[PDB]
Amino acid sequence: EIMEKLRTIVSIGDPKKKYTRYEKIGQGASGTVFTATDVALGQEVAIKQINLQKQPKKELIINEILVMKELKNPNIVNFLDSYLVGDELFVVMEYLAGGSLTDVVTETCMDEAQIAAVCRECLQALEFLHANQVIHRNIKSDNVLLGMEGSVKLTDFGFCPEQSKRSEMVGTPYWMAPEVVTRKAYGPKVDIWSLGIMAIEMVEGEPPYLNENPLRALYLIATNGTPELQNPEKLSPIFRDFLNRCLEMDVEKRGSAKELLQHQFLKLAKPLSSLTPLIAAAKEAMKS
Ligand SMILES: N[C@H]1CC[C@@H](CNc2nccc(Nc3ncc(C(F)(F)F)s3)n2)CC1
């Protein structure tokens, strides 16, 4: 087969002439991710190189790249373009110079206004994914990019994780909502849950359940959910309220993305340029 319908996403041309100074940045289960420079625009991009030959049956399934093509939003890392050489698909996406939310969380302390900005930006992205029936599933520190000009973007989701029951857990899935860990049918609002968790992490410098064995963490998530703050009184009442609405254990009561964009806590937001000192400090701390 000719893999039809590649026509819909591939542009003509050699991606090794359109882009230069490739540098490897991420191996990965089916994907090398490079960084590189557009020879015409100067712009830096991420390029995922995919061997369709080793793409087990996942052929039209992996033209959910076409879904990436249709669904574009300021608060996600967007598809830019794609090229083909032989059976190597190069997918070109936005590159954001900055750091991950994790790095900033580990090396700086954030105030409530800056946390309010991040959450605002994350909720805009969520609202978008949700209106288009995408659940992200992995809303963690590690999948938020903070841009040196104040951009916030979500990263590392599909749709268009499942571990055999017979397997040990090694990692703790600290971000996962209750209804997820007990393997019930779930919806969008799990992303809200996880955002909740992520907000705690921005305050505490760390995720919940890091002192915890994975199976205990699972249990606590199912029975208690709302991880329960080291020192509540440290947080403004409005922020705790925000947390509460995100971390409501009954799905129906927990807030939607759209609801929560109207919550009073996002009115604290500082402008996004307030995130840029956070990044510079994180870069400085990591020169080790
Ligand atoms: N899934 C997480 C997000 C990617 C991250 C890679 N490191 C990094 N560090 C500084 C800036 C930056 N910007 C990016 N823009 C686009 C990008 C790609 F599309 F590759 F994800 S990474 N990325 C580590 C784990």
Distances 52 to 29, 47, 83, 158 between C-alpha atoms, Å: 13, 15, 13, 17
| CA nearest to 203, candidates 169, 247, 159 | 247
Ligand 1 site residues, Cβ closer than 6 angstroms: 33, 46, 77, 93-96, 98-100, 142-143, 145, 155-156
CB-based contact 247:196 (threshold 8 Å): yes
Residues 6 or more apart whose CB falls under 8 angstroms from that of 262 comprise none
Which atom of ligand 1 is nearest the CA belonging to 99? 10
CB-based contact 189:165 (threshold 8 Å): no
What is the distance between the alpha carbons of residues 67 and 129, in angstroms, rounded to a whole number?
Answer: 11
What is the distance between the alpha carbons of residues 121 and 270, in angstroms, rounded to a whole number?
Answer: 12
Give the orientation angle of helix 189-204 with respect to helix 237-246, to 10 degrees.
140
Q: What is the resolution in angstroms?
A: 2.1
| Nearest CA, atom 9, ligand 1 | 99
Domains defined along the chain, listed by start: 15-94 (3.30.200.20), 98-285 (1.10.510.10)
120 is catalytic: no
Name the pairing type of β-strands 19-26 and 32-38.
Answer: antiparallel
Task: Supply φ then ψ for residue 32, to 5 degrees.
Answer: -95, 135
What is the distance between the alpha carbons of residues 102 and 166, in angstroms, rounded to a whole number?
Answer: 31
Taking the centre of ligand 1 as the mean of its atom positions, its distance from the CA of residue 145, in whole angstroms, is 7
| CA nearest to 123, candidates 188, 170, 79 | 188
Elucidated via: X-ray
Residues 6 or more apart whose CB falls under 8 angstroms from that of 18 comprise 38, 39, 40, 83
Distances 271 to 9, 192, 209, 283 between C-alpha atoms, Å: 36, 22, 32, 21
Cβ–Cβ contacts within 10 Å for residue 161, how many? 8
Q: Which entry of 137, 216, 245, 254 is annotated as an active-site residue? A: 137
Task: Supply φ then ψ for residue 214, to 5 degrees.
Answer: -45, -45
What is the distance between the alpha carbons of residues 52 and 89, in angstroms, rounded to a whole number?
Answer: 7
CB-based contact 192:137 (threshold 8 Å): no
What is the distance between the alpha carbons of residues 37 and 232, in angstroms, rounded to a whole number?
Answer: 46
Which atom of ligand 1 is nearest the CA belonging to 33? 20
Which atom of ligand 1 is nearest the CA belonging to 156? 1
What is the distance between the alpha carbons of residues 171 and 165, in angstroms, rounded to a whole number?
Answer: 14
Read off the tokens for 178: 């209750």
Residues 6 or more apart whose CB falls under 8 angstroms from that of 95 comprise 35, 43, 44, 45, 46
Q: What would the 3-class secondary structure string for the chain be? A: CCCCCCCCCECCCCHHHHEEEEEEEECCCCCEEEEEEECCCCCEEEEEEEECCCCCCCCCHHHCHHHHHHCCCCCECCEEEEEEECCEEEEEEECCCEEEHHHHHHHCCCCHHHHHHHHHHHHHHHHHHHHCCCCCCCCCHHHEEEECCCCEEECCCCCCCCCCCCCCCCCCCCCCCHHHHCCCCCCCHHHHHHHHHHHHHHHHCCCCCCCCCHHHHHHHHHHCCCCCCCCHHHCCHHHHHHHHHHCCCCCCCCCCHHHHCCCHHHHHCCCHHHHHHHHHHHHHHCCC
